[PDB]
Amino acid sequence: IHRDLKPSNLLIN
Amino acid sequence: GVATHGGSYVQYNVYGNLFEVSRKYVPPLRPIGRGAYGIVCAATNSETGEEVAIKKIGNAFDNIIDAKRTLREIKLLKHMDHENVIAVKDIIKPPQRENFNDVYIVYELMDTDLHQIIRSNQPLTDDHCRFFLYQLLRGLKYVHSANVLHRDLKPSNLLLNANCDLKLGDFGLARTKSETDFMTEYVVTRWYRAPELLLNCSEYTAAIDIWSVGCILGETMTREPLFPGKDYVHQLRLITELIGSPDDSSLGFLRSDNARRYVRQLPQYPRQNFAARFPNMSAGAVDLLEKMLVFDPSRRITVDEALCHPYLAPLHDINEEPVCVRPFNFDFEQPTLTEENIKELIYRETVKFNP
Ligand SMILES: Nc1ncnc2c1ncn2[C@@H]1O[C@H](COP(=O)(O)OP(=O)(O)NP(=O)(O)O)[C@@H](O)[C@H]1O
Ligand SMILES: [Mg+2]
Description:
Bound molecules: phosphoaminophosphonic acid-adenylate ester, magnesium ion
Number of helices of chain B: 11
Number of helices of chain A: 0
Strand order of the largest sheet of chain B: 4-5-6-8-7
Radius of gyration of chain A: 9 Å
Chain A: Mitogen-activated protein kinase kinase 1
Strand content of chain B: 15-25%
Number of strands of chain A: 0
Radius of gyration of chain B: 21 Å
Assembly: dimeric
PDB class: transferase
Entry title: Crystal structure of Mitogen Activated Protein Kinase 4 (MPK4) from Arabidopsis thaliana
CATH class of the domain at 112-315 in chain B: Mainly Alpha
Helix content of chain B: 25-40%
Shape of chain B: globular
CATH topology of the domain at 112-315 in chain B: Transferase(Phosphotransferase), domain 1
Structural class of chain A: little secondary structure
Largest sheet of chain A: none
Shape of chain A: rod-shaped
Oligomer: heterodimer
CATH architecture of the domain at 112-315 in chain B: Orthogonal Bundle
Keywords: Kinase, plant protein
C-alpha cells in the first residue's frame, strides 16, 4: 500500500 | 479445565458457559463476542503457538433452520479463499458421534469488529472509511463471483485488526444467486436490510448486499446507524425520510397491491439532498452513499461499479481484485436434508480436520 493513504492503526481494548 | 473423555477433551468454564474442546486448545480464554447463535472465545492452540477464535454454537441441530445455517457457515467459509474473507482453522470433532449437539468452529482471530470501532472514542478519518469500504467491496466482489449473496452484512460481521485489515464473516444467512427465496431469517438487526427484504420480495439480487454496504458506509461517516427502526414499519419510514418516498417506477419490483399499499400508507416525504444531510464530509463519499441507498434495486450501483468510483480510485487496482474461479454448487435446499443428515455432513467436515 502507499503512504499517501495508509490509515493510522486503530486503538482496541 | 477438567479433562474428560480420557483426557482427549477438556471443559472450560467461560462466564458460566461450558466450552468442551480438544486438548490442544488452552487458556488464556477471552470472551470476544456473543451473537444470536454463537458464543465466541479467544484461546491458544498449544500445538501451533497461535491465538484462535473458538465459536461455540449451542444446540446446533435442534431444528432444520439452525442446522442449515451452521452448514452454510462451514461450507461457504471452507469454499472461500480470499484475504477479505475470514478463514476457518478447525472444526472440533465431537467426542462421540452419538451425542453431537454443540458445534465448535475455530476461526482465525481478529482484534475487534467494525461495530466496536464505530462506537469507540477515537477518530474515523476519511482514509479509514475509504480503506474499510474498499476491502468490503473487494471481498464482496469475490463472494458474489462465487455465485453467493451474503445477505446479512452489518458492522459487527466485519472483523478488523488494528492495522485496519478487514474480513467478512458470518455467512450463515447467505444464499446462492439461484436459491433466492422469500423467507428472511430473524436477525437482531433489521437496520441493514434492503427494502426488497423488508417487503418480502421473493426474487432479489446482489443489490441487497449493496444496500447494506451503503448503510455501513453511512454509519462509518456519521458514527450512528442511519435507519434504526424500532420495528419494520418505522424502518421503512426512516429510509424514506432520508431518500424520499418512492415514485411508482421505483415500486415496480413489488409483487402485490398489499405491499404497495403498505408503502403508500406511510407519510410521504421528499428526497433529501444528501449534501445537506451530510455536510463537511467527503464529496466522493456522499456521492457514493447516494448511489447505494437507492430504493429501486435495479437502480443501485453494483459492487464492480463501486470499485471504480472516484472515492476508491486511490485504492482501486484490477490486478489485486480476484474473482472466484470455482463456483459454489452445494444445494442447501435438497428435500432429503434433515437435522440428522446435516449432522452427519458436519461430523464429516470435522473428521477432515481431526481424523
Ligand atoms: N474470528 C473472530 N475474531 C474476532 N472476533 C470475532 C470472530 N468471530 C466473531 N467475532 C466476534 O464475536 C461476535 C459474534 O460473531 P458472529 O459470528 O456474528 O456470531 P453469530 O451469532 O454466529 N452471528 P449473528 O447472530 O449474526 O451475530 C461478533 O460481534 C464478532 O465481533
Ligand atoms: Mg454463522
